[PDB]
PDB file of N, CA and C in Angstrom:
ATOM      1  N   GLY H   1       0.861  -1.206   0.063  1.00  0.00           N
ATOM      2  CA  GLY H   1      -0.137  -0.145   0.306  1.00  0.00           C
ATOM      3  C   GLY H   1       0.750   1.606  -0.033  1.00  0.00           C
ATOM      4  N   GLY H   2       1.599   1.586   0.871  1.00  0.00           N
ATOM      5  CA  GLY H   2       2.241   2.706   0.955  1.00  0.00           C
ATOM      6  C   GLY H   2       3.665   2.719   0.671  1.00  0.00           C
ATOM      7  N   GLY H   3       3.809   1.599   0.150  1.00  0.00           N
ATOM      8  CA  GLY H   3       5.180   1.273  -0.444  1.00  0.00           C
ATOM      9  C   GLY H   3       5.586  -0.086  -1.314  1.00  0.00           C
ATOM     10  N   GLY H   4       6.400   0.237  -2.427  1.00  0.00           N
ATOM     11  CA  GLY H   4       6.377  -1.248  -2.972  1.00  0.00           C
ATOM     12  C   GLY H   4       7.476  -0.799  -4.289  1.00  0.00           C
ATOM     13  N   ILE H   5       7.785  -2.075  -4.925  1.00  0.00           N
ATOM     14  CA  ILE H   5       8.931  -1.786  -6.052  1.00  0.00           C
ATOM     15  C   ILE H   5       8.029  -1.807  -7.038  1.00  0.00           C
ATOM     16  N   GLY H   6       6.890  -2.062  -7.106  1.00  0.00           N
ATOM     17  CA  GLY H   6       5.946  -2.134  -8.494  1.00  0.00           C
ATOM     18  C   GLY H   6       4.834  -0.661  -8.631  1.00  0.00           C
ATOM     19  N   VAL H   7       5.259   0.121  -7.924  1.00  0.00           N
ATOM     20  CA  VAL H   7       4.511   1.401  -8.056  1.00  0.00           C
ATOM     21  C   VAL H   7       5.221   2.761  -8.331  1.00  0.00           C
ATOM     22  N   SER H   8       4.738   3.500  -8.757  1.00  0.00           N
ATOM     23  CA  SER H   8       5.779   5.291  -9.239  1.00  0.00           C
ATOM     24  C   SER H   8       5.550   5.772  -8.179  1.00  0.00           C
ATOM     25  N   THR H   9       6.998   6.447  -7.457  1.00  0.00           N
ATOM     26  CA  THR H   9       6.832   7.436  -6.396  1.00  0.00           C
ATOM     27  C   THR H   9       6.626   9.112  -7.004  1.00  0.00           C
ATOM     28  N   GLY H  10       6.422   9.260  -8.144  1.00  0.00           N
ATOM     29  CA  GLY H  10       6.107  10.718  -8.483  1.00  0.00           C
ATOM     30  C   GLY H  10       5.703  10.971  -9.839  1.00  0.00           C
ATOM     31  N   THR H  11       5.399  11.967 -10.264  1.00  0.00           N
ATOM     32  CA  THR H  11       4.660  12.145 -11.785  1.00  0.00           C
ATOM     33  C   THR H  11       5.286  13.481 -12.361  1.00  0.00           C
ATOM     34  N   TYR H  12       5.830  12.886 -13.706  1.00  0.00           N
ATOM     35  CA  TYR H  12       6.737  13.841 -14.498  1.00  0.00           C
ATOM     36  C   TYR H  12       5.899  15.086 -15.331  1.00  0.00           C
ATOM     37  N   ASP H  13       6.136  16.218 -14.738  1.00  0.00           N
ATOM     38  CA  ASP H  13       5.813  17.497 -15.278  1.00  0.00           C
ATOM     39  C   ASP H  13       6.581  18.384 -15.656  1.00  0.00           C
ATOM     40  N   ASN H  14       6.575  18.597 -16.813  1.00  0.00           N
ATOM     41  CA  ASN H  14       7.603  19.815 -17.568  1.00  0.00           C
ATOM     42  C   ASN H  14       6.894  20.830 -17.882  1.00  0.00           C
ATOM     43  N   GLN H  15       5.695  20.921 -17.650  1.00  0.00           N
ATOM     44  CA  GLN H  15       4.811  22.035 -18.474  1.00  0.00           C
ATOM     45  C   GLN H  15       4.737  23.330 -17.153  1.00  0.00           C
ATOM     46  N   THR H  16       4.559  24.620 -18.686  1.00  0.00           N
ATOM     47  CA  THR H  16       5.088  26.014 -17.527  1.00  0.00           C
ATOM     48  C   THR H  16       3.721  26.417 -17.519  1.00  0.00           C
ATOM     49  N   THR H  17       3.134  26.697 -16.856  1.00  0.00           N
ATOM     50  CA  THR H  17       1.816  27.567 -16.620  1.00  0.00           C
ATOM     51  C   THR H  17       1.803  29.090 -16.458  1.00  0.00           C
ATOM     52  N   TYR H  18       1.115  29.820 -16.923  1.00  0.00           N
ATOM     53  CA  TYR H  18       1.004  31.003 -16.804  1.00  0.00           C
ATOM     54  C   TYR H  18      -0.287  31.373 -15.971  1.00  0.00           C
ATOM     55  N   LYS H  19      -0.643  31.813 -15.000  1.00  0.00           N
ATOM     56  CA  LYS H  19      -1.048  32.198 -14.032  1.00  0.00           C
ATOM     57  C   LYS H  19      -2.062  33.866 -13.872  1.00  0.00           C
ATOM     58  N   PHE H  20      -2.442  34.773 -14.657  1.00  0.00           N
ATOM     59  CA  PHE H  20      -2.677  35.815 -14.675  1.00  0.00           C
ATOM     60  C   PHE H  20      -3.410  36.234 -13.335  1.00  0.00           C
ATOM     61  N   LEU H  21      -2.754  37.019 -12.590  1.00  0.00           N
ATOM     62  CA  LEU H  21      -3.900  37.323 -11.005  1.00  0.00           C
ATOM     63  C   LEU H  21      -4.424  38.596 -11.311  1.00  0.00           C
ATOM     64  N   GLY H  22      -4.486  39.457 -12.052  1.00  0.00           N
ATOM     65  CA  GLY H  22      -4.928  40.669 -12.133  1.00  0.00           C
ATOM     66  C   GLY H  22      -4.002  41.722 -11.824  1.00  0.00           C
ATOM     67  N   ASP H  23      -4.661  42.825 -12.126  1.00  0.00           N
ATOM     68  CA  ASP H  23      -3.858  43.921 -12.085  1.00  0.00           C
ATOM     69  C   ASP H  23      -2.046  43.826 -13.076  1.00  0.00           C
ATOM     70  N   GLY H  24      -2.386  43.393 -13.852  1.00  0.00           N
ATOM     71  CA  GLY H  24      -0.991  43.075 -14.435  1.00  0.00           C
ATOM     72  C   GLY H  24       0.207  41.911 -14.033  1.00  0.00           C
ATOM     73  N   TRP H  25      -0.064  41.364 -12.996  1.00  0.00           N
ATOM     74  CA  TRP H  25       0.259  40.548 -12.421  1.00  0.00           C
ATOM     75  C   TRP H  25       0.259  39.365 -12.463  1.00  0.00           C
ATOM     76  N   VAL H  26       1.380  38.475 -12.457  1.00  0.00           N
ATOM     77  CA  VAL H  26       1.672  37.151 -13.158  1.00  0.00           C
ATOM     78  C   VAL H  26       2.397  35.832 -12.530  1.00  0.00           C
ATOM     79  N   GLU H  27       1.487  35.135 -12.202  1.00  0.00           N
ATOM     80  CA  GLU H  27       2.410  33.927 -11.277  1.00  0.00           C
ATOM     81  C   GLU H  27       3.042  33.097 -12.313  1.00  0.00           C
ATOM     82  N   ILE H  28       4.364  33.139 -12.707  1.00  0.00           N
ATOM     83  CA  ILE H  28       4.348  31.802 -13.780  1.00  0.00           C
ATOM     84  C   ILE H  28       5.488  30.702 -13.086  1.00  0.00           C
ATOM     85  N   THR H  29       4.870  29.743 -12.969  1.00  0.00           N
ATOM     86  CA  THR H  29       5.294  28.651 -12.677  1.00  0.00           C
ATOM     87  C   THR H  29       5.694  27.566 -13.536  1.00  0.00           C
ATOM     88  N   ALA H  30       7.417  27.409 -13.326  1.00  0.00           N
ATOM     89  CA  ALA H  30       7.772  26.651 -14.049  1.00  0.00           C
ATOM     90  C   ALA H  30       8.348  25.017 -13.810  1.00  0.00           C
ATOM     91  N   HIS H  31       7.691  23.559 -14.644  1.00  0.00           N
ATOM     92  CA  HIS H  31       7.986  22.687 -14.023  1.00  0.00           C
ATOM     93  C   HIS H  31       8.533  22.218 -15.029  1.00  0.00           C
ATOM     94  N   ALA H  32       9.930  21.329 -14.090  1.00  0.00           N
ATOM     95  CA  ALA H  32      11.020  20.857 -14.939  1.00  0.00           C
ATOM     96  C   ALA H  32      11.081  19.297 -14.531  1.00  0.00           C
ATOM     97  N   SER H  33      11.053  18.267 -15.139  1.00  0.00           N
ATOM     98  CA  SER H  33      11.175  16.840 -15.292  1.00  0.00           C
ATOM     99  C   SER H  33      12.505  16.607 -15.902  1.00  0.00           C
ATOM    100  N   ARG H  34      13.282  15.893 -15.366  1.00  0.00           N
ATOM    101  CA  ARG H  34      14.337  15.301 -16.174  1.00  0.00           C
ATOM    102  C   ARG H  34      14.709  13.936 -15.544  1.00  0.00           C
ATOM    103  N   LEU H  35      14.743  12.968 -16.558  1.00  0.00           N
ATOM    104  CA  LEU H  35      15.685  11.627 -16.182  1.00  0.00           C
ATOM    105  C   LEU H  35      17.429  11.822 -15.593  1.00  0.00           C
ATOM    106  N   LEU H  36      17.232  11.450 -14.884  1.00  0.00           N
ATOM    107  CA  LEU H  36      19.092  11.386 -14.446  1.00  0.00           C
ATOM    108  C   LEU H  36      19.382  10.582 -14.250  1.00  0.00           C
ATOM    109  N   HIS H  37      20.662  10.336 -14.308  1.00  0.00           N
ATOM    110  CA  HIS H  37      21.809   9.098 -14.673  1.00  0.00           C
ATOM    111  C   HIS H  37      22.702   9.008 -13.444  1.00  0.00           C
ATOM    112  N   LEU H  38      23.101   8.037 -13.040  1.00  0.00           N
ATOM    113  CA  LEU H  38      24.246   8.125 -12.062  1.00  0.00           C
ATOM    114  C   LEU H  38      25.009   6.742 -12.202  1.00  0.00           C
ATOM    115  N   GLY H  39      25.989   6.935 -11.520  1.00  0.00           N
ATOM    116  CA  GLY H  39      27.592   5.762 -12.013  1.00  0.00           C
ATOM    117  C   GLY H  39      28.037   5.810 -10.550  1.00  0.00           C
ATOM    118  N   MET H  40      28.823   4.830 -10.681  1.00  0.00           N
ATOM    119  CA  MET H  40      29.778   4.358  -9.041  1.00  0.00           C
ATOM    120  C   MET H  40      30.618   5.585  -9.594  1.00  0.00           C
ATOM    121  N   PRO H  41      31.129   6.074  -8.395  1.00  0.00           N
ATOM    122  CA  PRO H  41      32.302   6.884  -8.712  1.00  0.00           C
ATOM    123  C   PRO H  41      33.888   6.123  -9.252  1.00  0.00           C
ATOM    124  N   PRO H  42      34.703   6.690 -10.057  1.00  0.00           N
ATOM    125  CA  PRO H  42      35.726   6.114  -9.689  1.00  0.00           C
ATOM    126  C   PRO H  42      36.662   5.806  -8.673  1.00  0.00           C
ATOM    127  N   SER H  43      36.409   6.203  -7.588  1.00  0.00           N
ATOM    128  CA  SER H  43      36.972   5.943  -6.090  1.00  0.00           C
ATOM    129  C   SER H  43      36.131   6.169  -5.047  1.00  0.00           C
ATOM    130  N   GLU H  44      36.513   5.979  -4.073  1.00  0.00           N
ATOM    131  CA  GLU H  44      35.239   6.135  -3.081  1.00  0.00           C
ATOM    132  C   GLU H  44      35.897   6.869  -2.038  1.00  0.00           C
ATOM    133  N   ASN H  45      36.995   7.342  -2.054  1.00  0.00           N
ATOM    134  CA  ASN H  45      37.881   7.954  -1.233  1.00  0.00           C
ATOM    135  C   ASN H  45      37.596   9.627  -1.458  1.00  0.00           C
ATOM    136  N   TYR H  46      37.402  10.835  -0.513  1.00  0.00           N
ATOM    137  CA  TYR H  46      37.779  11.939  -0.885  1.00  0.00           C
ATOM    138  C   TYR H  46      39.262  12.201  -1.089  1.00  0.00           C
ATOM    139  N   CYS H  47      39.487  12.612  -2.371  1.00  0.00           N
ATOM    140  CA  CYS H  47      40.840  13.326  -2.939  1.00  0.00           C
ATOM    141  C   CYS H  47      41.510  14.684  -2.816  1.00  0.00           C
ATOM    142  N   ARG H  48      42.674  14.719  -2.041  1.00  0.00           N
ATOM    143  CA  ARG H  48      42.843  16.137  -2.383  1.00  0.00           C
ATOM    144  C   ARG H  48      44.157  16.447  -3.202  1.00  0.00           C
ATOM    145  N   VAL H  49      43.093  17.026  -4.506  1.00  0.00           N
ATOM    146  CA  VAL H  49      44.264  17.240  -6.116  1.00  0.00           C
ATOM    147  C   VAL H  49      44.348  18.183  -6.430  1.00  0.00           C
ATOM    148  N   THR H  50      46.047  18.306  -7.224  1.00  0.00           N
ATOM    149  CA  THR H  50      46.428  19.418  -7.470  1.00  0.00           C
ATOM    150  C   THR H  50      46.507  19.253  -9.035  1.00  0.00           C
ATOM    151  N   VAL H  51      46.264  20.691  -9.393  1.00  0.00           N
ATOM    152  CA  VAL H  51      46.826  20.906 -10.872  1.00  0.00           C
ATOM    153  C   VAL H  51      47.713  21.658 -11.256  1.00  0.00           C
TER     154      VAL H  51
ATOM    155  N   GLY P   1     -24.040  78.712 -12.721  1.00  0.00           N
ATOM    156  CA  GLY P   1     -23.817  77.395 -11.796  1.00  0.00           C
ATOM    157  C   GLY P   1     -23.780  76.217 -12.787  1.00  0.00           C
ATOM    158  N   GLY P   2     -24.695  75.763 -13.438  1.00  0.00           N
ATOM    159  CA  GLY P   2     -25.148  74.816 -14.077  1.00  0.00           C
ATOM    160  C   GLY P   2     -25.134  74.996 -15.369  1.00  0.00           C
ATOM    161  N   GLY P   3     -24.637  76.323 -16.006  1.00  0.00           N
ATOM    162  CA  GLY P   3     -23.898  76.845 -17.627  1.00  0.00           C
ATOM    163  C   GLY P   3     -23.582  78.300 -17.246  1.00  0.00           C
ATOM    164  N   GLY P   4     -22.987  78.185 -18.454  1.00  0.00           N
ATOM    165  CA  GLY P   4     -22.356  79.572 -19.150  1.00  0.00           C
ATOM    166  C   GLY P   4     -21.278  79.273 -20.023  1.00  0.00           C
ATOM    167  N   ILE P   5     -20.983  80.528 -20.831  1.00  0.00           N
ATOM    168  CA  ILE P   5     -20.273  80.683 -22.305  1.00  0.00           C
ATOM    169  C   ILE P   5     -18.458  80.626 -21.530  1.00  0.00           C
ATOM    170  N   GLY P   6     -18.296  80.691 -20.266  1.00  0.00           N
ATOM    171  CA  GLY P   6     -17.013  80.390 -19.849  1.00  0.00           C
ATOM    172  C   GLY P   6     -16.434  79.352 -19.064  1.00  0.00           C
ATOM    173  N   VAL P   7     -17.207  78.541 -19.030  1.00  0.00           N
ATOM    174  CA  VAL P   7     -16.977  76.894 -18.356  1.00  0.00           C
ATOM    175  C   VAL P   7     -16.729  75.963 -19.645  1.00  0.00           C
ATOM    176  N   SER P   8     -16.026  75.436 -19.356  1.00  0.00           N
ATOM    177  CA  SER P   8     -15.897  73.773 -20.316  1.00  0.00           C
ATOM    178  C   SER P   8     -17.503  72.772 -20.175  1.00  0.00           C
ATOM    179  N   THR P   9     -17.429  72.296 -21.005  1.00  0.00           N
ATOM    180  CA  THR P   9     -18.764  71.259 -20.809  1.00  0.00           C
ATOM    181  C   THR P   9     -18.311  69.885 -20.782  1.00  0.00           C
ATOM    182  N   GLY P  10     -16.926  69.523 -21.092  1.00  0.00           N
ATOM    183  CA  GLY P  10     -16.369  67.942 -20.651  1.00  0.00           C
ATOM    184  C   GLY P  10     -14.612  68.329 -20.792  1.00  0.00           C
ATOM    185  N   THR P  11     -14.308  66.886 -20.812  1.00  0.00           N
ATOM    186  CA  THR P  11     -12.155  66.724 -21.223  1.00  0.00           C
ATOM    187  C   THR P  11     -12.076  65.937 -22.007  1.00  0.00           C
ATOM    188  N   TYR P  12     -10.852  66.242 -22.403  1.00  0.00           N
ATOM    189  CA  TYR P  12      -9.917  65.686 -23.513  1.00  0.00           C
ATOM    190  C   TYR P  12      -9.325  64.777 -22.955  1.00  0.00           C
ATOM    191  N   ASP P  13     -10.067  63.457 -23.513  1.00  0.00           N
ATOM    192  CA  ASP P  13      -9.309  62.149 -22.746  1.00  0.00           C
ATOM    193  C   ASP P  13      -8.900  61.265 -24.462  1.00  0.00           C
ATOM    194  N   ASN P  14      -7.919  60.986 -24.755  1.00  0.00           N
ATOM    195  CA  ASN P  14      -7.417  60.142 -25.574  1.00  0.00           C
ATOM    196  C   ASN P  14      -6.269  58.697 -25.405  1.00  0.00           C
ATOM    197  N   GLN P  15      -6.483  58.447 -24.465  1.00  0.00           N
ATOM    198  CA  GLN P  15      -5.405  57.865 -23.683  1.00  0.00           C
ATOM    199  C   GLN P  15      -6.264  56.261 -23.703  1.00  0.00           C
ATOM    200  N   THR P  16      -5.323  54.958 -23.538  1.00  0.00           N
ATOM    201  CA  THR P  16      -5.733  54.062 -24.400  1.00  0.00           C
ATOM    202  C   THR P  16      -5.417  53.325 -22.809  1.00  0.00           C
ATOM    203  N   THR P  17      -6.315  52.825 -22.329  1.00  0.00           N
ATOM    204  CA  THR P  17      -6.154  51.801 -20.502  1.00  0.00           C
ATOM    205  C   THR P  17      -6.446  50.454 -20.922  1.00  0.00           C
ATOM    206  N   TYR P  18      -5.666  50.035 -20.094  1.00  0.00           N
ATOM    207  CA  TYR P  18      -5.475  48.149 -20.055  1.00  0.00           C
ATOM    208  C   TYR P  18      -6.090  47.870 -18.850  1.00  0.00           C
ATOM    209  N   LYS P  19      -6.978  47.386 -18.250  1.00  0.00           N
ATOM    210  CA  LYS P  19      -7.410  46.582 -17.017  1.00  0.00           C
ATOM    211  C   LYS P  19      -7.195  45.142 -17.101  1.00  0.00           C
ATOM    212  N   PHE P  20      -6.368  44.598 -16.295  1.00  0.00           N
ATOM    213  CA  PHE P  20      -5.864  43.273 -16.647  1.00  0.00           C
ATOM    214  C   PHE P  20      -7.148  42.563 -15.366  1.00  0.00           C
ATOM    215  N   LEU P  21      -7.458  41.686 -15.749  1.00  0.00           N
ATOM    216  CA  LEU P  21      -8.934  41.808 -15.100  1.00  0.00           C
ATOM    217  C   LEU P  21      -8.632  39.914 -14.079  1.00  0.00           C
ATOM    218  N   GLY P  22      -7.813  39.161 -14.866  1.00  0.00           N
ATOM    219  CA  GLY P  22      -7.342  37.853 -13.933  1.00  0.00           C
ATOM    220  C   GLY P  22      -7.621  36.592 -15.032  1.00  0.00           C
ATOM    221  N   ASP P  23      -7.561  35.294 -14.969  1.00  0.00           N
ATOM    222  CA  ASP P  23      -7.713  34.375 -15.922  1.00  0.00           C
ATOM    223  C   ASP P  23      -7.228  34.648 -17.347  1.00  0.00           C
ATOM    224  N   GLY P  24      -6.398  35.611 -17.365  1.00  0.00           N
ATOM    225  CA  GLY P  24      -6.016  36.234 -19.385  1.00  0.00           C
ATOM    226  C   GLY P  24      -7.301  37.059 -19.485  1.00  0.00           C
ATOM    227  N   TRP P  25      -8.323  37.700 -18.969  1.00  0.00           N
ATOM    228  CA  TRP P  25      -9.212  38.495 -19.602  1.00  0.00           C
ATOM    229  C   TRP P  25      -8.892  39.988 -19.261  1.00  0.00           C
ATOM    230  N   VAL P  26      -8.876  40.574 -20.319  1.00  0.00           N
ATOM    231  CA  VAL P  26      -8.172  42.158 -20.614  1.00  0.00           C
ATOM    232  C   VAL P  26      -9.510  43.075 -21.061  1.00  0.00           C
ATOM    233  N   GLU P  27      -9.673  43.895 -20.359  1.00  0.00           N
ATOM    234  CA  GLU P  27     -10.704  45.066 -20.711  1.00  0.00           C
ATOM    235  C   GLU P  27      -9.573  46.205 -21.635  1.00  0.00           C
ATOM    236  N   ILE P  28     -10.014  46.429 -22.378  1.00  0.00           N
ATOM    237  CA  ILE P  28      -9.463  47.739 -23.307  1.00  0.00           C
ATOM    238  C   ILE P  28     -10.371  48.643 -23.401  1.00  0.00           C
ATOM    239  N   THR P  29      -9.970  49.781 -22.789  1.00  0.00           N
ATOM    240  CA  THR P  29     -10.923  51.022 -22.902  1.00  0.00           C
ATOM    241  C   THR P  29     -10.308  52.088 -23.661  1.00  0.00           C
ATOM    242  N   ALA P  30     -10.571  52.538 -25.032  1.00  0.00           N
ATOM    243  CA  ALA P  30      -9.802  53.210 -25.904  1.00  0.00           C
ATOM    244  C   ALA P  30     -10.959  54.851 -25.733  1.00  0.00           C
ATOM    245  N   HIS P  31      -9.922  55.397 -25.140  1.00  0.00           N
ATOM    246  CA  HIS P  31     -10.602  56.831 -25.366  1.00  0.00           C
ATOM    247  C   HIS P  31     -10.243  57.729 -26.495  1.00  0.00           C
ATOM    248  N   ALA P  32     -10.734  58.461 -27.161  1.00  0.00           N
ATOM    249  CA  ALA P  32     -10.364  58.990 -28.550  1.00  0.00           C
ATOM    250  C   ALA P  32     -11.211  60.803 -28.266  1.00  0.00           C
ATOM    251  N   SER P  33     -10.632  61.659 -28.414  1.00  0.00           N
ATOM    252  CA  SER P  33     -11.002  62.764 -28.463  1.00  0.00           C
ATOM    253  C   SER P  33     -10.490  63.819 -29.582  1.00  0.00           C
ATOM    254  N   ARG P  34     -11.003  64.370 -30.372  1.00  0.00           N
ATOM    255  CA  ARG P  34     -10.530  65.056 -31.397  1.00  0.00           C
ATOM    256  C   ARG P  34     -11.552  66.170 -31.855  1.00  0.00           C
ATOM    257  N   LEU P  35     -10.269  67.208 -31.667  1.00  0.00           N
ATOM    258  CA  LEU P  35     -11.502  68.845 -32.201  1.00  0.00           C
ATOM    259  C   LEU P  35     -11.863  68.380 -33.645  1.00  0.00           C
ATOM    260  N   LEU P  36     -12.988  69.151 -33.708  1.00  0.00           N
ATOM    261  CA  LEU P  36     -13.813  68.492 -35.105  1.00  0.00           C
ATOM    262  C   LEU P  36     -14.696  70.175 -35.308  1.00  0.00           C
ATOM    263  N   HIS P  37     -14.471  69.985 -36.691  1.00  0.00           N
ATOM    264  CA  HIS P  37     -14.790  71.283 -37.002  1.00  0.00           C
ATOM    265  C   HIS P  37     -16.346  71.456 -37.865  1.00  0.00           C
ATOM    266  N   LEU P  38     -16.801  72.151 -38.071  1.00  0.00           N
ATOM    267  CA  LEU P  38     -17.894  72.339 -38.909  1.00  0.00           C
ATOM    268  C   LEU P  38     -18.251  73.596 -39.549  1.00  0.00           C
ATOM    269  N   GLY P  39     -18.604  73.621 -41.035  1.00  0.00           N
ATOM    270  CA  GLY P  39     -18.888  74.971 -41.712  1.00  0.00           C
ATOM    271  C   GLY P  39     -20.484  74.742 -42.524  1.00  0.00           C
ATOM    272  N   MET P  40     -20.708  75.833 -42.644  1.00  0.00           N
ATOM    273  CA  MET P  40     -22.402  76.090 -43.723  1.00  0.00           C
ATOM    274  C   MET P  40     -22.366  74.964 -44.502  1.00  0.00           C
ATOM    275  N   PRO P  41     -23.302  74.138 -44.988  1.00  0.00           N
ATOM    276  CA  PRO P  41     -23.805  73.850 -46.226  1.00  0.00           C
ATOM    277  C   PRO P  41     -23.619  74.829 -46.820  1.00  0.00           C
ATOM    278  N   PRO P  42     -23.326  73.993 -48.121  1.00  0.00           N
ATOM    279  CA  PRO P  42     -23.587  75.218 -49.915  1.00  0.00           C
ATOM    280  C   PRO P  42     -24.895  75.382 -49.885  1.00  0.00           C
ATOM    281  N   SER P  43     -25.548  74.485 -49.427  1.00  0.00           N
ATOM    282  CA  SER P  43     -27.222  74.719 -49.585  1.00  0.00           C
ATOM    283  C   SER P  43     -27.612  73.976 -48.342  1.00  0.00           C
ATOM    284  N   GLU P  44     -28.755  74.848 -47.839  1.00  0.00           N
ATOM    285  CA  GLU P  44     -29.796  74.526 -46.787  1.00  0.00           C
ATOM    286  C   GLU P  44     -30.716  73.555 -47.450  1.00  0.00           C
ATOM    287  N   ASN P  45     -30.992  73.291 -48.685  1.00  0.00           N
ATOM    288  CA  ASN P  45     -31.966  72.214 -49.031  1.00  0.00           C
ATOM    289  C   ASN P  45     -31.210  70.813 -49.206  1.00  0.00           C
ATOM    290  N   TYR P  46     -32.332  69.936 -49.115  1.00  0.00           N
ATOM    291  CA  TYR P  46     -32.128  68.672 -49.314  1.00  0.00           C
ATOM    292  C   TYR P  46     -32.002  67.973 -51.500  1.00  0.00           C
ATOM    293  N   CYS P  47     -31.034  68.142 -51.735  1.00  0.00           N
ATOM    294  CA  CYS P  47     -30.881  67.647 -53.170  1.00  0.00           C
ATOM    295  C   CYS P  47     -30.742  66.026 -53.756  1.00  0.00           C
ATOM    296  N   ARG P  48     -31.948  66.243 -54.707  1.00  0.00           N
ATOM    297  CA  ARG P  48     -31.503  65.108 -55.024  1.00  0.00           C
ATOM    298  C   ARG P  48     -30.819  64.602 -56.732  1.00  0.00           C
ATOM    299  N   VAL P  49     -29.547  64.039 -56.601  1.00  0.00           N
ATOM    300  CA  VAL P  49     -28.268  64.212 -57.243  1.00  0.00           C
ATOM    301  C   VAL P  49     -28.342  63.273 -57.869  1.00  0.00           C
ATOM    302  N   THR P  50     -27.516  63.451 -59.612  1.00  0.00           N
ATOM    303  CA  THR P  50     -27.564  62.189 -60.249  1.00  0.00           C
ATOM    304  C   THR P  50     -26.209  62.547 -60.890  1.00  0.00           C
ATOM    305  N   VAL P  51     -25.616  61.214 -60.910  1.00  0.00           N
ATOM    306  CA  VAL P  51     -24.239  61.374 -61.767  1.00  0.00           C
ATOM    307  C   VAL P  51     -24.188  60.780 -62.357  1.00  0.00           C
TER     308      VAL P  51
END
């Protein structure tokens, strides 16, 4: 019910909405949704690196 | 008080106003004021004229 491997935990919304409040004021709500990718770090250490 | 030769009977407004009511609706009020001229007709008759 509250959780499981076979249910989605969110919705994809990337549409931009314009809300005209009156007196010329506009509420602009920008939705952005992106499929993000991740991969293992080349090292698990914190490295102090010089160039 | 209510009338006379030395008082103006109206105001000159030729500005255009935009009233944003909300939900994207706009009340556009266009004011137009023009100095108008008139002159006597060449004839005081109604004429039935052929070309």
